[model samples]
Target: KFPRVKNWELGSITYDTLCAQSQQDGPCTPRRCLGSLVLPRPAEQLLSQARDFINQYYSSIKRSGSQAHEERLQEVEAEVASTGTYHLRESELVFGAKQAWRNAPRCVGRIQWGKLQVFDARDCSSAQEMFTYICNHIKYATNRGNLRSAITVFPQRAPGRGDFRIWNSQLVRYAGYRQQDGSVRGDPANVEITELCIQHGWTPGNGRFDVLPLLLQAPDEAPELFVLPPELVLEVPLEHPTLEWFAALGLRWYALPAVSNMLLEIGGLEFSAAPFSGWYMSTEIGTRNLCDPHRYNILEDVAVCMDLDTRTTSSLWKDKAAVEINLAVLHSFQLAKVTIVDHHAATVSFMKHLDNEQKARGGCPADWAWIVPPISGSLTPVFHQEMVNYILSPAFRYQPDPW
Candidate 1:
């Protein structure tokens, strides 16, 4: 039975339940009056947007004058106008993949965006194949702790059919469990999906850093469950430079921080399974993952170990502990020979990227809040610089998770 539904244009058209058979971005559409369901952008809008993306990308790369470029543009335009749909050529796909990274406003590491390896799996048609493809991606991107930025694009959406989806936000992530006492045992952020994994026959682990299996879904088929081989996942044990006790905490993190749940919008087409990544900025692990109160909540423990007064508000315990944790993250990665960027170093390069963007395109779009390292805002140059934020085509985007 359908749950209560309220729609704007057609009030409570729940009896048109047959309309749910049609294609939609989410579970329901206007015809069925399923409340707040997402629908795909109209074909015309997608084609027009894609055209603009192609032009902008070509212009930015100084290839607008090429005869091949002109031919490709005219072809895409004619195809869209005639059929209301068109597919991107492999060359165009490659350019769009890199440009999407360059246009990613929240990523401070866009300077290396042009170097991403694009794995075109557009012809793929099965969940098992997708599992193998993603496994290769994890191994290549992980690089045994030397992470590389990479994206794998699956087949495009076809009318009246479901689309390929990677259910995990990242190819690698820890499972979270809600205990009987209403306390989370692992990564709290992952609790909902972790339960889904368990319901689908995944064995939940008792450890804090248990890697979850991939829920790979092909169009019109039940999702397939695939466990990542233990050898494929690389992690670094975190420790401080001078504190021997820090190593005893048994804290560690995966090397490759690939975000797999985001939608990759090129022109107007959305690839729901375009997993991408770069080496972690030390603070993403130290300040946000391990130190966030809702997360590991290790600051007070580390402070007590440092012999700092944890009882007083004026003690600045969190500040001191946070700094040490971040320092330990840097020290651990460096000692393990993993490619990790310190907050100061990352911000410095971001400033240089700004100058490069200014010289090349007059200005760059950036989200100041995201560009600034979570641990130190004012300490980074990007925190002080005023940046204009806007939508740019060929971009990676956060989409509602496909449950």
Candidate 2:
């Protein structure tokens, strides 16, 4: 049965037939809906999923039922029968990566899904090799702040072997040092990883914005730390358009938002260390990263600086300060020539993506909470749109931390 989706603002409705293709179940049930959960908790007769994926690929190329398509299907089954595992063709990998991005429910930038650059790192055998591959990915994706979208696929998990992993949550994150006074000097979210880095013999930095090193692990081996070259990491110093004193705060953020910890599954194959990156949506940094209580928590400080009446909640000091912070993020990124999207523009583009996906695939699976930007929920068009959430194949998934 298809689900009905509606746009409250436009008064239009559509039925989602594409979700029928979903082979997995989400946390939702008849009695309750758990669609807002960030993580939901595969494999198959390898031939079945492999065959289905091959069928999809052939259909995409308009070669379904062709001789080559049938032969490729047979080839996958034969390989699986003999070896218990098979590999993807480079083209298949590319298509799978794009499809995964297209199927991602949490991303607001699915309109550019097909434009990802897939880097094949399956040939990498050592942690050193992984470090080199990651460095290249960082350099290429950064592109002097132009910020191209890309994913580097590491070796897939094998039957008897331990998985390859990138221990860092992201390729670039600021170090969080737990101070003696029981406060965090940097990003509190990173304290555990920062402590792990020091335990592994890393020389910890005392500064608030110190970039952390990468922890690359080859199969069955302990993680190894490699510090990124300073030039390869592009950072922007945040400043406001109107507040002259803002620049002295020394707040900065990395331009490339490369998530290194997610698993990329393609045709039932899991790449545990595949890292992907795209340009930032300004609110990700401006509203959540900077203002979240567990994060930088700058709203109160900023409100104080703005001389707002923080004594009472009716003054809306938090709201006023948050707006200026978001503005500062937009202004700073633009001034630095970095690729970033403001919340208004990002949400508008997502609405356009919804229309495109509806036309092309019958309906799109979307999580309303994530699609709506952090600061302005009702103000964004997506906030008024009802969405269906389901799990689709060739998806990026969260895995356990290596440490």
Candidate 3:
């Protein structure tokens, strides 16, 4: 039986036949569905997953039963049998990288999934080399603010050696300096990494928006700090179109949202330091990063600036200030000619993506909580649409901190 997904706004229905392909179990059952929780096996498991991925690649090329497909399967089996592990071919690696993006349930940007640039950095050995590769990736993806999606995969975890790792959660993050007054200076989310960098001999910057250096870790070695060249980081200074004083806030954000800490699982091989980046969906910065209480917490400041009565809940001060802030983010990014998708446009495209996946694979796995924009929930079509959540491969997953 397939899960019947329905859209309440449009009264549309689709059967998610794709959920059946999930080999891993989710945190859900007949008793309770804990779909909100965020955040997989062996050599026998490896062989099967590798075979399945090979089959999937061949099927995409309309050669599922061809001699090449059969030979490829045999090659994987033989390699795994002999060495207890296998390597992905260049073409297979590219295909798997794109597939992993398409299968990511929390990403609403899957409509542009196939356009990813996959950089194979499997030959990298040292932390310095990793830093160079990462710098190149940032340069390519940033594109002077045009913002292209890209992933650079470092060496996969071998049988005997340790894994290559990036200590920062993102390639570009503001340093959060914990002041003596018990307040965080920059992005509160990065306080731990900031402390680690300071402890590792990084001279801490006093500004609220100081970009953190990369903590690159090679196999069985300590992390080495590498500061990103200023030119490589494309940042947009936020300003409102109508609010004249908004520009004085001294707020800005990096153009690239490159996640560096996630593990990339292709077949059974794990690439521990495969950093991937995509253009921002505005709300991620405007709502979550800028407005969240634990983050920048700019709502009350913006409200007070706007001459709104913050003391009364009836004034809708939070909502008004949030909209203006989100508007400023969009306005500033657009003014800088940077690629950024607003939530309305993004969610609409996601609806189209859902339809496309429904026809191509039967059902698309989606998490409603994550897929829906944080600020405008019901306004987006995804809020009214029921979704099925399941694990799919090849996939990007979170790994433990290298520290």
Candidate 4:
């Protein structure tokens, strides 16, 4: 279903479709192919490039992961690997995929940012209740367009301890990201769309929208970055009833639709005019010069602070400088956002959860750094969300050795 074949097509038939099992990552692999894409490249070409991308990506992971095993051994740190670990990264949750998958066996899983909670994908029914609670607290009312949102967390404290008041909402250092090689490390992008609300029979242009409030001009209405594989978002409905949803969002999304495996869109416009063949593991829409082989980009550790209420620029954020990259010199790009998740209560909650989580896994939880800086200095503290991008990515892996 490239730029043509506007008609709906059902290419496959499977009886176990419902339980056929699509993970939080979306429809495993096959279903990901079924998503509608408006790419200019022929469907066949796009798929071929993707398969190669996956193969090459995992090959690198396998190599680097093998070499780093020893160096990472003593530092395997707290938490289990997959089932052994209770982590915030759930593959199916982030990519909007119907399956729990990483391009291949590269071991790439989806990640999210939040406080004490458990991923619903592990338990569907319970997750429904969790989503309902978060939605109610965040969403104001009927005015909220088609944004059906849910958050999942890996709780800290195991069997309750101390007079800690069961600080359930607490957190440690929370980050959402995927390495330049499609693994988790760089700050992850947080976004969502709800088919749950779509059933209500209210379409975007029809009147109300999902995701955001009413629209003046579909923020996502025009073709923005449209990512199909992993999950191909056909079109983002930006026209909403109000901008109030912005406050609730805490930050703007990675444009509408998405930028992933297959397709990319923007500005009510399709990416048809561009090369459209190369793939991008993006943090933002895209600012890299795909054609430039010598160009390289890394994440910026500098964080910015802003005043949301006045909607004015604040000061230069130079908090914790992590990685550095320049835009003008290379095709790689950097974008920024400021959120209000910083506060005494919020920081304490995050720290408690992280500490407990580490301890529960039976590790030394001493000398752990503060999830948030001491709540002494600043007032109206707002944390910045930077959009980072990298070419397919890589991460360090660990395993225990016999003495």
lDDT of 2 by residue, 99-170 (tens): 999999999999899899999999999999999999999999999989899999999999999999999999
lDDT of 2 at 301: 94
What order do candidates take by lDDT, descending? Answer: 3, 2, 1, 4
| Winner by TM-score between candidate 4 and candidate 3 | 3
Tens digits of per-residue lDDT for model 4 on 1-403?
Answer: 1111111122321121121111123222544452222221233333333333333333434643454443332122222222232222233123212111111111111111221122332222232333333233233211122322232321222222211010111111112232356543312221112221123232422211113211011111221111112121112211112232323322222222211111111111111111101111221121121111221112121122222222232522222111111111112111121111223444344334333433432211111112113222233121121111111211111111100
Counting clashing residue pairs in each candidate, in order, gives: 1, 0, 1, 59
All candidates: TM-score: 0.87, 0.98, 0.98, 0.19
- For all candidates in order, the CA lDDT equals 0.80, 0.92, 0.93, 0.22
- Candidate 2 clash total? 0
Worst 10-residue lDDT window, candidate 4: 164-173
State the local distance difference test value for candidate 4: 0.22
For candidate 3, lDDT tens digit of each residue in 220-300? 998999989999998999999999999999999999999999999988788998999999999999999999999999999
Residue 194, candidate 2: Cα error in Å is: 1.0
**Candidate 3: stretches off by over 4 Å:** 40-42
Q: Which consecutive 10 residues in model 2 have the weakest lDDT in total?
A: 38-47
TM-score of 2: 0.98
What global local distance difference test value does model 3 have? 0.93
- Maximum-lDDT candidate: 3
Query: Which regions of candidate 2 fall more than 4 Å away from where they truly are?
Result: 41-44
